Structures are given as C-alpha cells and as structure tokens.
RNA sequence: CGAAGGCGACUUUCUGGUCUGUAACUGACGCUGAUGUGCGAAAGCGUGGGGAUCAAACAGGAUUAGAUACCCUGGUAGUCCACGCCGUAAACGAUGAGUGCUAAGUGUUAGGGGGUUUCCGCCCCUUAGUGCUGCAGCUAACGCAUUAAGCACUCCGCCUGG
C-alpha cells in the first residue's frame, strides 16, 4: 500500500518486492492452499521454530 | 550488501608474552586479552611495520 | 507498570506497518509485557483507535 | 508422608557412600540415633554428632573410607519393613556374610549388633544388614 | 468464591479463641459456605464440569476433618452438626 | 606357570557378497590353582593359534581370589548383565559342584569345595564374566578388619 | 630449596583456570574461587601437590627409569621438547600415534626403521635409485621423525609419564592405566583428576604457566641421577 | 493453564485450581485406594434446530496395462448449536500414584528478590514449572539420567510362549 513516485518503474518494483516479502501475504496463502490437520501444523510450526 | 563474518572469542587474563605466543599459534595479527597485572583489556597486534603494537581499550 | 489501551502513541510503535503485531523477537520486550500488551492492542482494535489492516 | 523413616535413613547412607561423600545429615529419632551410634562402635562410620534443633534435631554421620580410596560399607540392606515385619528367635538369628558383616536387631534391651544377641540369648525384630 | 468480609464474618462464630483461624471447626464452616456457594453456581450452570471436581475435592476435605474431629472429642462434633446443618 | 583350559570354540561366519567368512573364535580360562584366575577371548582362523591368542589375552587381566582354605570366604552372587552365578561356601570334603563354563573358572583357582548354581542366562561368555565379577567382590576376614578398624578376633 | 616460591609461581599465571560454564565438579578441591568467569586454582594447595610431584620423580630416576614427556597442545608443543633434552628423556611434539605404548611391537618395528633409513643413505645404495623414489624414501624419513622424533633412541617401555593435558591427550592416559604405569600431569578446569595419580593443578593455556612449571619437573630427575 | 480428554478474537458476570512470600493458627488431621461413583478426542445414535465452507456415500470427466484408487467438477449424511446417549483412540512421556535421597552445565516461564539501572536497559543470586546436554548408577542393547528407566519404602493396576 506504499506509493512510489519520482523514479522509474524498475525501481518501484524493488521497493514493492521487499514490501511484500516483509508481509504475511505470500507465506500466508501458500500455507492455506490446502487444509492441514489440526495437529500437524503444531509440528509444522515446531519445525519452523526449532530451526529458527 | 557486505557480510562481515564474526569470530567470537572469550576474553581471558594473561601476560603480554602469552598473548604473543597464542597469537603466533594461530597466525592472527590481532589478539585481545585482559592484561594479567594491569587488569585492562589489551589488544596485541602486528603492525604494517611487522613489529608488534599494544593497544589498551 | 500496566499498558492502558487509550495510550495510542506508545501502543502504535508496536503495531506493524500494515496493522499486524510485531513479535517480541523483533521488538525485544519481555514475556509478560508482550501479553499484557496484546490484550491492550486488541481492545484498541475494537474501538477503532488502531486498524486491523491498513 | 514418607512411610519408613529408618529405611530413608539407610538409603541416605548408601547414596552418600556411592559418590564418596563424607558428611550428611538426617532428620533423626531415637532409633535413628542409636543405629547411627552402633555403626561407629562396630566401626563403619567415623563419628556421629549431636542432636540440637527445636523440632526433630538433626545428626551428622561422617562416613569412613579406606586408605586406598576404598569404602568400608559395601552394601546396605533394610530387611524388616512395613507390610512384612520379620522377627527372629535367638536360635536361628542369622549371621551376615559368613560372620563378616553385622545385623543390628531391635530386641527388648535396646538395639544390639549381630554378635551381642546370641550370647545375650535374646531375639527380636531384625532391622537391617550392614556390610 | 466468597468475599473476605464474608469469609472473615464466618470465622467469628466458630472461632474458639481470638486469633485461632485454622482450627477444624473454623475451617469446616468456611467450607460449608464454599460448598453452598459453588453448587448454587453449579445449579444454574449444569455443564461446568471443571468446577465440579473443585467442589468434589473440598467435599472430601470437609469429610476428612469431620472424621478427624470425632476421633478426639465427640461432643464438639455434635455441636457443629446442630450449628450448621449437615447430615450424618 | 599357567594352566590353559578352553570353554568352547565357536564357528562364526559373516555374510559377504562373494565367499563368506571363516572366523573361529574361542574363550579360555587361565588360572594357577592358588588364588589367581583370568579369562579372555581370541579371534583367529588357525584353531591352535586361536587358542593361544585367547591365552595371552587372559594374561593381561588376572584377579586375586581371596580364600579361607579349601573354600571361598563368604556367600556372594555375581552379576554381569543377565548372567548371575551363586556361590555358597562348603565343607572341605564336598567337591566343587558347578555347571559347564563356571566349573572351569572355579577349578583353576584352588577351591575344590563350594556350592554353586548358575542362575539367569546361559551363554558362556557372560557367566564366566559374571563369576569373575563375583570373585572380584570377595573379602577376607583380615583385610576388612584393617578397613573397619577392629581385629580378627573383635569381628567375631 | 624445596618448592617453587609464591612470587614466581603466580607470576607465570597458574592461578587462572578455564571458564565457569566449562567446569568439572571433581576439581572443587583444587579451586580457590572464580574471578569474572575464570576460576582461581588454590595456589597454596598446588604447592602442597608440586612438592609431592617432586618427591617421587626424584626417586624414579634414582632407579634409572625412563619418564615419557608428552605435549600436543599448540601453545605448549615445543616447551616440552627443550625440557626433555635438558632431562635426557623422550619427548612427544606431534599427535599421539595411537599405540606407541600398547602396540609398540609394531612401533619399535618402525623405530628399527629410523635407525636404518638414515643409515641407508649415508652409505651407498643411493645413486642407483630413481630420483622420485629418493623423494618418498625421504618423505618417509621426515614423517617418521615428525611423530616418532622423540622416541628416536627409546627401545623399551617407560616407567612414568608426564602429560600437559589429560583432555587433548586422553589417548595416552587410557594406555597408561592399562599398563599400570604411574601418571603425573598438569590439570585444571575441564580436566578429570581421577585418572591422574599424581595431580598438579596449574593453568594450561599459557606458556609461562607451562614453561615455569614443566621445567622443574624436568629438572626433578637430574638430581635424582647423582 | 488443566487430573486427563483438552483449551487461541474481545468484554462482562459466575466459578475451580496452582505457585511465591510471611510466619499468626489447627496439631498427624497423612498417603494409596479394590467394589463404587463421575469426567472422557473424534466418528457414531436419538429428539429437534441450523446449514457457510469442507466433505464419506454417490454422479460424471480424465489417467493407467487395469480401478471401486490417485486427479478434477458436482454433491448427501456429517462437520455447527441445544438436550439426552454411546465410553471407546498409537486416550502415548508406548513409562501408576506418593515421599525422600544422589556430579554438574545450560535455555526459558510466573515470579521473588536483587545489584545495577535502562531512558526500562539490563545484568546479577531465589520456589515452583518447562526443555536441551551429561557423570555416578542402571539397561539385553538403544538409551535413561534431580521432570530416572539411579538408590529406597508404602499402596494399587497388570504380565507369565505364539
């Protein structure tokens, strides 16, 4: 939702590519592509935390 | 970007002669220690001279 | 101390750049501060002092 | 709600013996004091100490060790226990470890060693084996 | 549970002498307040099962003190049944 | 001088892609009939050389067996894992009664009169080591009084 | 006189130990206190140990025995070679070869080689060889005196062993206790004193803590000779 | 956090338990617990509701060597609520409960202190939780190791070839 002006379009993309990667959009909808079981995400979050 | 690799070391008390010995046993140009008698943090280093220099922080 | 849910300015440095919550991993607060914070950030979402998303 | 006091005494002594400790303390009694008094007379511990506190005064034991870092008490077993009390007549009052170790026995004179119960010709509840 | 001004009130009647809270009949009376308070809660909330073993535990700690109180003086036990209504 | 005695030879093969293996191992008991006994194993292929491999391996570990004469000093049970032998002293005219592997570790020290029974497991590696570990933990009457601080007559 | 005096013993810096969080609980007897992460080796008690370390090592050389000196920690490698030559004993600079006290019926097979391979090129049988076989006969020659350089003239088992660290040289101490060879060594924090019979509590990651402590134990055998 | 099953927006009411500290008070009032009596995931069943997504059964299209599988479109019971049931799970830490005792190192939780402070930062010693390493000891071996599978004592459940 960030406005980028006074430049080209190939530099507003460089802002926007990291203003989406630092957001819960792409990692959120890839998670909800399919219903996971209510006790396998507690281990999926555990693997995504024990590795840090 | 530039990535500076950190080498962690734990500060320890010793003679300056000991710091020279340990620094040579690694070939490191810098060795930082706490001085045995002065109690202060000391950095023995090899100058561009090739001679040793001693910094107290 | 205790976070009051009206004190918006100290409470909105903890909200994200979209309206999410910063974890205490990236902010650096303690444990009991973070969950005393989160019951005040969510009473302030309910009375429109802070958004849900921007 | 520990249920056997002088077995809890007797495994404090075994666990201190295993880690080469030389000093431990007990929540004491009369029978705890006078079992610990009878090990120094037979010569397993060095010296037992005083009973001092307001409620259930503690006492310290001072285990004794060999000169080649060996231990004196090698094995220590409670035989009578709640649920199954064992009693012995003076005729079949048994020798521990072919007469080497002892068997402190509560008889009607106060507790006495293995040796001191046959020539006294009294039996009673046989408390433990010390070897 | 019950408030402290409700709790400090009920330890005045069954007190044996001043500053003797923790006496058996002064901590049975405060249980019978807590028994009657929670099963009135539990009467209108019949599905609350986690609060029920809180009730059923302090029923057990009241019974173990009534059984204790008979073993050393029976005439004090008869007075407490008449003072606050219990069966048995 | 040492007295060799075998317990058993074993015929062991490990599976190879080509031809399988021909390892014949053996454990022996080595003692002197005076209070000093050791055991050991030896792996080779030449069978009389497989014996002498185990004999010299027994030579590095000899345990001193204390003894009141013609018997063992007191009553013990040895333990090593699952093997467990029993060891009661006997009168000096009874004869040593023991099983297969535990007789060889009892004859090679001079006792010749004790009660025994190998409780527990059965494999000859373990019960010959659960007997040495039993005979490791024997105590004379004289050296206990050194530690305990009394004399030999004060213990009785 | 008898012991190291108190001034030059702590001037070498032997009162330093290793770090707290890096501690062995069996070394509680030989620690006076910890000062800023570091422990304080009881200095009065290690004097009561280094004299006992001086007493037997006096009379080991009185029998004419051979005491083995080993040192492999990188800040104490060549502080034990120069003290073994002054003592006339056998040193180890490089890593433990893995059996030079236990499988030394195959190590003395190669101490026989170093008594032979240097004889092999001082005489003839050297011109007829190919020039690259000259290299591997010399590439064998230095690698013998790398590891077995201090065991050059040693042909029998030792009767005592002197280690600078039981941690890094744990392969040697495990061979010592199987042969019933008595053992003396410099230990500190992160060292087990159980396998060492004759304990010297001193610092281990300083040169003067080694060199002003390993020299007197090297000196301890010289006046045991005469 | 709870005894387990389990519990995740927010607010109020009603209510249960644990922990810390102080020592005022009661003075063994304790522990375990057959029979008994109550809780007990999901899927089920009953009487009604409600029905958004999802989805057994079912229908159709592809794949394949072949299908009733996998994949795709659609879809009913169910999933959800209220009241009664059912009482079973790899209900698992495959480890009953209670109380003692026995190297240490290290994260973290509510604290308690603290020394400091910090612009609150922290870093320090402290019950009770919760993890990861690791001696002694134990184990058949993996491994366990003050949250024992170590050393003991009590009581209950249970096993004795497939």
Is the distance from CB of G102 to CB of G92 less than 8 angstroms?
Answer: no
Q: Is F75 on the interface with D (CB under 8 A)?
A: yes
Q: Do D98 and F75 touch (CB under 8 A)?
A: yes
Q: Within 10 A of G3 (CB to CB), how many other CB atoms are there?
A: 13
The CB-based long-range contact list for C26-34 (8 Å cut-off, 24+ gap) reads C33/C3
Q: Find the nucleotide nearest A45 (Cα to C1′).
A: H8
E10: Cβ under 7 Å from strand H?
Answer: no
Structural tokens at position C51: 């958004």
Question: Burial, G38: exposed, middle or buried (Cβ in 10 Å; 0-12, 13-18, 19+)?
Answer: buried
Is the distance from CB of C36 to CB of C2 less than 8 angstroms?
Answer: yes
The CB-based long-range contact list for D42-49 (8 Å cut-off, 24+ gap) reads D42/D102, D42/D113, D42/D130, D42/F148, D42/F150, D43/D72, D43/F148, D43/F149, D43/F150, D44/D72, D44/D73, D44/D130, D44/F148
Q: 3-state secondary structure string, chain C? A: CCCCCCCHHHHCCCECCCCCECCHHHHCCCHHHHHHHHHHHCHHHHCCCCCCCC
Structural tokens at position F28: 């022996």
Q: Within 10 A of C37 (CB to CB), how many other CB atoms are there?
A: 21
Is the distance from CB of D48 to CB of D37 less than 8 angstroms?
Answer: yes
Give the DSSP letter of residue G183. E
C-alpha dist (Å) from residue E43 to E38, E51, E55, G16: 8, 12, 12, 72
Strands G183-187 and G160-163: parallel
Q: What are phi and psi of F10, to 5 degrees?
A: -125, 150
- For residues G89 and G68, what is the distance between their CA atoms, to the nearest angstrom? 7
Span CA (F121) to C1' (H159), Å: 20
Question: Burial, B28: exposed, middle or buried (Cβ in 10 Å; 0-12, 13-18, 19+)?
Answer: middle
Strand H: positions under 7 A of a protein C-beta atom: 2-5, 9-11, 14-17, 24-26, 28-31, 38-40, 54, 83-84, 98-111, 121-122, 136-137, 139-141, 150-155
| Residues of chain F contacting D70 with CB distance shorter than 8 Å | 147
- Expressed in Å, this structure's resolution amounts to 6.8
Question: Which B residues in the span 1-57 are in contact with G, Cβ-Cβ below 8 Å?
Answer: 10, 12-15, 17-18, 21-22, 25, 36
| B15 contacts: CB under 8 Å, gap ≥ 6 | B36, G13, G206, G208
* Total CB pairs under 8 A between chain B and G: 30
- D-chain residue closest to F150, CA distance: D43
Is the distance from CB of G202 to CB of G41 less than 8 angstroms?
Answer: yes
C-alpha dist (Å) from residue G168 to B14, G28, G83, G100, G171: 21, 21, 20, 16, 8
Q: Do D100 and F141 touch (CB under 8 A)?
A: yes
Q: Neighbours of B (≥3 Cβ pairs closer than 8 A)? A: G
Question: Burial, D13: exposed, middle or buried (Cβ in 10 Å; 0-12, 13-18, 19+)?
Answer: buried
Residue with tokens 């080498």: B7
Question: Which C residues in the span 1-54 are in contact with A, Cβ-Cβ below 8 Å?
Answer: 18, 20, 54
Classify the phi-psi angles of F35: left when phi > 0, otherwise alpha if psi is within -120 to 50, otherwise beta: left
- A-chain residue closest to C53, CA distance: A1
Is the distance from CB of F57 to CB of F41 less than 8 angstroms?
Answer: yes
| Residues of chain G contacting B8 with CB distance shorter than 8 Å | none
- For residues G68 and G80, what is the distance between their CA atoms, to the nearest angstrom? 10
Is the distance from CB of F36 to CB of F59 less than 8 angstroms?
Answer: no
Size of chain E, expressed as the number of residues it contains: 88
E46: Cβ under 7 Å from strand H?
Answer: yes
Residues 24-43 on chain C lying near strand H, CB distance under 7 A: 28-32, 38-39, 42-43
Identify the residue among C18, C25, C51 best suited for mutation to test binding to A, counting A beta carbons within 10 A and taking the highest.
Answer: C18
C-alpha dist (Å) from residue G172 to G104, G167, G221: 13, 10, 21
Span CA (G51) to C1' (H18), Å: 59
- For residues C9 and F95, what is the distance between their CA atoms, to the nearest angstrom? 97
């Amino acid at each position: 939702t960030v406005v980028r002006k006074n430049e080209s379009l190939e530099d507003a993309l460089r802002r926007f590519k990291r203003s989406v990667s630092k957001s819960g959009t792409i990692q959120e909808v890839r998670k909800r592509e399919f219903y996971e079981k209510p006790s396998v995400k507690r281990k999926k979050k555990s693997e995504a935390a024990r590795k840090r | 970007i530039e990535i500076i690799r950190s080498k962690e070391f734990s500060l320890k008390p010793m003679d300056s002669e000991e710091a020279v010995l340990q620094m040579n046993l690694l070939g490191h140009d810098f060795f930082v220690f706490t001085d045995r008698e002065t109690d202060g943090t000391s950095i023995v280093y090899r100058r561009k001279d090739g001679k040793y220099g001693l910094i107290q922080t | 101390t205790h976070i009051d849910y009206k004190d918006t300015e100290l409470l909105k440095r903890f909200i994200s750049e979209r309206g999410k919550i910063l974890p205490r991993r990236v902010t650096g607060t303690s444990a009991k501060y973070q969950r005393m914070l989160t019951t005040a950030i969510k009473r302030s979402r309910h009375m429109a002092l802070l958004p849900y998303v921007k | 709600t520990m249920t056997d006091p002088i077995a809890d005494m007797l495994t404090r002594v075994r666990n201190a013996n295993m880690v080469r400790h030389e000093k431990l303390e007990l929540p004491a009694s009369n029978i705890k004091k006078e079992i610990a008094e009878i090990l120094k007379s037979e010569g397993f511990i060095k010296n037992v100490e005083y009973v001092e506190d307001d409620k259930q005064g503690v006492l310290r034991l001072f285990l004794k060790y060999g000169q080649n870092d060996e231990r004196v008490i090698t094995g220590l077993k409670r035989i009578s226990k709640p649920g199954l009390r064992v009693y012995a007549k003076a005729s079949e009052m048994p020798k521990v470890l072919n007469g080497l170790g002892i068997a402190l026995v509560s008889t009607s004179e106060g507790v006495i060693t293995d040796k001191e119960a046959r020539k006294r010709n009294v039996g009673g509840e046989i408390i433990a084996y010390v070897w | 549970a019950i408030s402290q001004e409700r709790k400090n009130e009920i330890i005045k009647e069954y007190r044996v002498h001043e500053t003797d809270t923790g006496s058996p009949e002064v901590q049975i009376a405060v249980l019978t307040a807590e028994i009657n308070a929670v099963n009135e809660h539990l009467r209108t909330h019949k599905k609350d099962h986690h609060s029920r073993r809180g009730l059923l535990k302090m029923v057990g700690r009241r019974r173990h003190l009534l059984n204790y109180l008979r073993s050393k003086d029976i005439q004090r036990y008869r007075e407490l049944i008449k003072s606050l209504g219990i069966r048995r | 001088e040492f007295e060799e005695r075998v317990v058993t030879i074993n015929r062991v093969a490990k599976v190879v892609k080509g031809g399988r293996r021909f390892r014949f191992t053996a454990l022996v008991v080595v003692g002197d009939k005076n209070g000093r006994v050791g055991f050991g194993t030896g792996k080779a292929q030449e069978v009389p050389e497989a014996i002498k491999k185990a004999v010299e391996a027994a030579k590095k570990d000899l345990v001193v067996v204390p003894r009141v004469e013609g018997t063992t000093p007191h009553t013990i049970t040895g333990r090593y894992g699952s093997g467990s032998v029993f060891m009661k002293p006997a009168a000096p005219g009874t004869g040593v009664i023991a099983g297969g592997p535990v007789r060889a570790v009892l004859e090679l020290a001079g006792i010749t009169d004790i009660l025994s029974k190998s409780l527990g497991s059965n494999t000859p590696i373990n019960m010959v080591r659960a007997t040495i570990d039993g005979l490791q933990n024997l105590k004379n009457a004289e050296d206990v009084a050194k530690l305990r601080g009394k004399t030999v007559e004060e213990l009785y | 006189m008898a012991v190291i005096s108190m001034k030059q013993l702590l001037e070498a810096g032997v009162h330093f130990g290793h770090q707290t969080r890096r501690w062995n609980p069996k070394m509680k007897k030989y620690i006076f206190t910890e000062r800023n992460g570091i422990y304080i080796i009881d200095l009065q008690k290690t004097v009561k140990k280094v004299d006992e370390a001086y007493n037997f090592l006096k009379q080991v050389s009185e029998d004419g025995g051979q005491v083995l000196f080993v040192g492999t920690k990188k800040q104490a490698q060549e502080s034990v070679k120069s003290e073994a030559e002054r003592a006339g004993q056998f040193y180890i600079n490089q890593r433990w070869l893995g059996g030079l006290l236990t499988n030394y019926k195959t190590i003395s097979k190669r101490i026989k080689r170093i008594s032979e391979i240097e004889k092999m090129e001082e005489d003839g049988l050297f011109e007829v060889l190919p020039k690259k076989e000259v290299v591997e006969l010399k590439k064998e020659y230095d690698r013998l005196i790398k590891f077995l350089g201090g065991i050059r003239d040693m042909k029998s088992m030792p009767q005592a062993l002197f280690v600078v660290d039981p941690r890094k040289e744990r392969n040697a101490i495990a061979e010592a206790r199987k042969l019933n060879i008595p053992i003396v060594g410099i230990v500190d924090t992160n060292c087990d004193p159980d396998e060492i019979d004759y304990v010297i509590p001193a610092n281990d990651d300083a040169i003067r803590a080694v060199k002003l402590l390993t020299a007197k134990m090297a000196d301890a055998i010289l006046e045991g000779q005469q």
